[PDB]
Amino acid sequence: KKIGLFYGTQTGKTKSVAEIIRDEFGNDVVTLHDVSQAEVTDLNDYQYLIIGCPTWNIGKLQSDWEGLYSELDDVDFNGKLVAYFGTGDQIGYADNFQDAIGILEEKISQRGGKTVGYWSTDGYKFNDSKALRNGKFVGLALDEDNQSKLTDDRIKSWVAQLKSEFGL
Numbered sequence: 001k002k003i004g005l006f007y008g009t010q011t012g013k014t015k016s017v018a019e020i021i022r023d024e025f026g027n028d029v030v031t032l033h034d035v036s037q038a039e040v041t042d043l044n045d046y047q048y049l050i051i052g053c054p055t056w057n058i059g060k061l062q063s064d065w066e067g068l069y070s071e072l073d074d075v076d077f078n079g080k081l082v083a084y085f086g087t088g089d090q091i092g093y094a095d096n097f098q099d100a101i102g103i104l105e106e107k108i109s110q111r112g113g114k115t116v117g118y119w120s121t122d123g124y125k126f127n128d129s130k131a132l133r134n135g136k137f138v139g140l141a142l143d144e145d146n147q148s149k150l151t152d153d154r155i156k157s158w159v160a161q162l163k164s165e166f167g168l
Ligand SMILES: Cc1cc2nc3c(=O)[nH]c(=O)nc-3n(C[C@H](O)[C@H](O)[C@H](O)COP(=O)(O)O)c2cc1C
Pocket: 008, 009, 010, 011, 012, 013, 014, 015, 054, 055, 056, 057, 058, 059, 060, 062, 087, 088, 089, 090, 093, 096, 097, 098, 099, 144, 145
């Protein structure tokens, strides 16, 4: 339909978060694509995109998003609105917190994607992040390992913001 959510997952947390994002948006709005089963051309099917990706192995892309990283050069994101979220561990990995979505966004916005859905760094404890854009996160940062009780409200709040930014 209108929003395509393309998520990568290893232990399933970003997946869970994606399911709640669909629930929050109201039913048919967001479709949930596991990028492990995706082709890079699937991104052509939407004008509004949500990109979901955890950071693994000290500052790296989740390996299914890594599998599509190079091929992002084969897609034109011009004219699309794009939002980002990920799961992360701010305590264990304070120098590389939410690096992944920062890596995806830098590439996608270079190919024409307009970023929406910036998120406040308030209430997170970390040192450095590739997701940082003029004092904000490039997208929604969830931490299921340390802040699981904050997740549901952070998504509900983020979804209401995206409706406004997507012009739904
Ligand atoms: C070996 C390992 C490395 C990790 N590296 C990072 C990291 O670099 N940055 C970060 O924010 N989180 C890191 N984490 C935390 C994961 O991103 C976190 O557990 C996330 O919720 C997993 O998402 P997923 O289940 O969708 O794969 C790491 C976790 C493991 C165990």
